[PDB]
Amino acid sequence: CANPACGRHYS
């Protein structure tokens, strides 16, 4: 993804 705050996926 281009933007820094994308989503909750990898911990």
**Contact partners, residue 2, CB within 8 Å, separation at least 6:** none
CA distance 7 to 1: 10
Tokens encoding 5 = 């705050």
Query: What CA–CA distance (Å, rounded) separates 1 from 9?
Result: 12
Q: Give the CB-side neighbour count of residue 11, counting CA atoms within 13 A.
A: 0
DSSP class of 3? S
Q: Which long-range contacts (CB under 8 A, 24 or more apart) does 6-11 make?
A: none
* Residues counted in the chain: 11
